[PDB]
Structures are given as C-alpha cells and as structure tokens.
C-alpha cells in the first residue's frame, strides 16, 4: 500500500504531514506560542560510511522511537529529511520551548543505540525558533536552520535558539 502520511523506515509522520498541517497547527496554537525544533543527527554520513547503511537504518529507527518516547503526545515528532527530525512544541514562553530542546539533546547524548554488533553513541544539534502568527513553514524552518547551523559550527551536541531579534544563542 501507499501511505503518504507515514515514513516507511521510522514509522513517523513525514514532511508532507507537517507541510499540510502546519498552518492549521499555528492558527490553533493560541493561547500558547508554537515553536519549531529542528534536530539533525551529528556526523551521520560518517556513521553510514563506517558501519554501513543497514546500521544507519537502525540508528534512524531507534532515534525515532526514542524521540517519540521523550515527547508529549500533542507535540508531534516528524522525520522531515534523511537525517533530520522536527518536533512541534507549544509552550507559554521561549524558556519552556528551549528547555524542551535542550533536554531532548541531552537524552540523545545519554542513550546509546543498540545494534547486533554493539552500541553506537550519537548526538544531535538542534535549532529552535518561535513561529509567529501567519508565518509560513519555510520561514520558521529557515530560522531554526540558522540556529542549528550555528550549533554545528560551535561544537555540535547542543540546542540553539534564534530569538525575536534573529540573534542566535546556545541554550544551557
Ligand atoms: N524532563 C521532562 N520530560 C518531559 C517533560 N514533558 C514530557 N517529558 C518527556 O516526554 C515523555 C512523554 O511524556 P507524556 O506523553 O506527557 O507522558 C508522561 C506523562 O503522562 C506522565 N508524567 C511523568 N512525569 C510527569 C510529571 O512530572 N508531570 C505530569 N503531569 N506528568 C508526568 O508519565 C508519562 C511518561 O513520563 P516519562 O517516562 O517521564 O516520559 C516523558 C518524558 O520523557 C517535561 O516537562 N520535562
Ligand atoms: N542509513 C541511512 N542513511 C540515510 C537515509 N537517508 C539519509 N541518510 C543519510 O543522511 C544523509 C543526508 O541525507 P539527505 O538529507 O536526504 O548522506 C545522507 C545519508 O548519509 C536512510 O534512509 N538510511
Ligand atoms: N510544551 C513542552 N514544555 C516542556 C517540555 N519539556 C519541558 N517543558 C517546559 O519546561 C518546564 C520545565 O521542565 P523541566 O525542567 O524538565 O521540569 C519538569 C520536570 O522535572 C517534571 N516533568 C513534567 N512533566 C514530566 C514528564 O512527562 N516526565 C518527566 N520525567 N518529568 C516531567 O516537572 C517539571 C515541571 O514541568 P512543567 O511544570 O510542565 O514545566 C516544564 C514545561 O513548562 C516539553 O516537552 N513540551
Ligand atoms: Mg505520551
């Protein structure tokens, strides 16, 4: 069968589910603020080159399961790209959204991925942005992407926030 609302590998909803639902989610976030958390597996190409793509698939499937287990039910985890996940967070303020982001980064770092021949330690870099009313998804992801990139530049295994001045800081 063809199930366009599910990533076959991880079982998570994919890009199309977020793209199609984002405007609705943002409209109905009130009275809360909506935040977008973009997560990329650190040096994932290297994992595949070292262990092979079958093991890479285990990493993706396991991380998906982990993220699902580490998030609240109304905050959906998507597999947005090949090595990229998105979590849509609703929160009262920036500090709460950033706490969600940094705790998820910390959990990833602290839970090895079991595979047949041992264990692999992975980390993620995360960028978080507020979605302002009526903004399209590409703008929100664009800003989170800037935050995430600065995270990769400054050491990886961390969560970054881009604020209302479009200035990026690491979340501690
Ligand atoms: N550190 C931290 N982690 C958070 C927070 N919100 C969600 N999580 C994480 O997301 C997982 C799933 O949350 P849930 O579906 O709401 O499902 C939760 C929730 O229904 C409940 N629960 C656990 N602790 C609390 C709590 O302190 N307050 C409330 N109201 N419920 C809790 O038990 C379920 C399973 O909890 P966990 O195994 O801990 O698993 C939690 C935890 O890993 C948070 O604010 N801080
Ligand atoms: N093992 C595995 N790696 C993947 C998969 N999709 C993407 N990748 C990895 O993620 C990197 C980026 O993929 P792109 O963003 O689609 O280069 C790829 C590859 O290393 C997959 O389905 N399985
Ligand atoms: N929307 C959203 N907000 C998040 C998430 N994670 C953290 N926050 C926000 O950050 C506040 C502090 O989280 P914390 O330091 O983990 O501090 C948390 C944590 O120690 C615990 N807690 C709450 N829920 C859970 C849970 O489901 N599992 C576990 N293990 N602890 C929880 O209670 C403390 C207070 O929780 P809150 O009053 O809810 O207050 C939370 C909440 O407003 C998230 O995944 N989604
Ligand atoms: Mg749950």
Method by which this entry was solved: X-ray
Contacts of 148 (CB under 8 A, 6+ apart): 38, 39, 40, 125, 126, 127, 160
Q: Which of 83, 95, 96, 135 is catalytic?
A: 83
| Nearest-atom index, ligand 3, CA of 70 | 45
> According to the annotation, is 99 in a ligand binding site?
yes
What is the spatial distance between Cα 170 and Cα 85, in angstroms, rounded to a whole number?
19
Q: Are 129 and 166 in contact (CB under 8 A)?
A: no
Residue with tokens 């995430």: 148
State this model's resolution in angstroms: 1.8
Residue with tokens 């940094």: 102
The Cβ-side half-sphere exposure at 155, using a 13 Å CA radius, reads 6
| Tokens (6 digits) for 93 | 């303020």
What residue's CA is closest to ligand 1, atom 14? Answer: 72
**What length is written for the chain?**
172
Domains located in the chain, CATH noted = 1-172 (3.30.70.270)
Residue 83 catalytic? yes
Which strands, in side-by-side order, build the sheet including 77-79? Answer: 77-79, 84-91, 33-41, 124-131, 158-162, 168-170
Ligand 2 binding pocket (C-beta < 6 A) is 9, 44-45, 48, 53, 56-57, 60, 81-83
| Ligand 3 neighbour 72 (Cβ under 6 A) | yes
């Amino acid at each position: 069968a063809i199930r366009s609302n599910m990533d076959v590998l991880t079982g998570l909803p994919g890009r199309r589910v977020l793209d199609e639902s984002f405007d609705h989610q943002l409209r109905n976030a009130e009275p809360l603020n909506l935040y977008l958390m973009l997560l990329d597996i650190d040096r994932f190409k290297l994992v595949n080159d070292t262990y092979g793509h079958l093991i890479g698939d285990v990493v993706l499937r396991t991380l998906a399961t982990y993220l699902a287990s580490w998030t609240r039910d109304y905050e959906t985890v998507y597999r947005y790209g090949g090595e990229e996940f998105i979590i849509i967070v609703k929160a009262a303020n920036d500090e709460e959204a950033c706490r969600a982001g940094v705790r998820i980064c910390q959990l990833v770092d602290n839970h090895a991925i079991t595979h047949s021949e041992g264990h692999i330690n992975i980390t993620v870099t995360a960028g978080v942005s507020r979605a302002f009313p009526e903004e399209p998804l590409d703008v929100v992801i664009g800003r989170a992407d800037r935050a995430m990139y600065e995270g990769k530049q400054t050491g990886r295994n961390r969560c970054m926030f881009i604020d209302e001045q479009n200035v990026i800081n690491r979340v501690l």
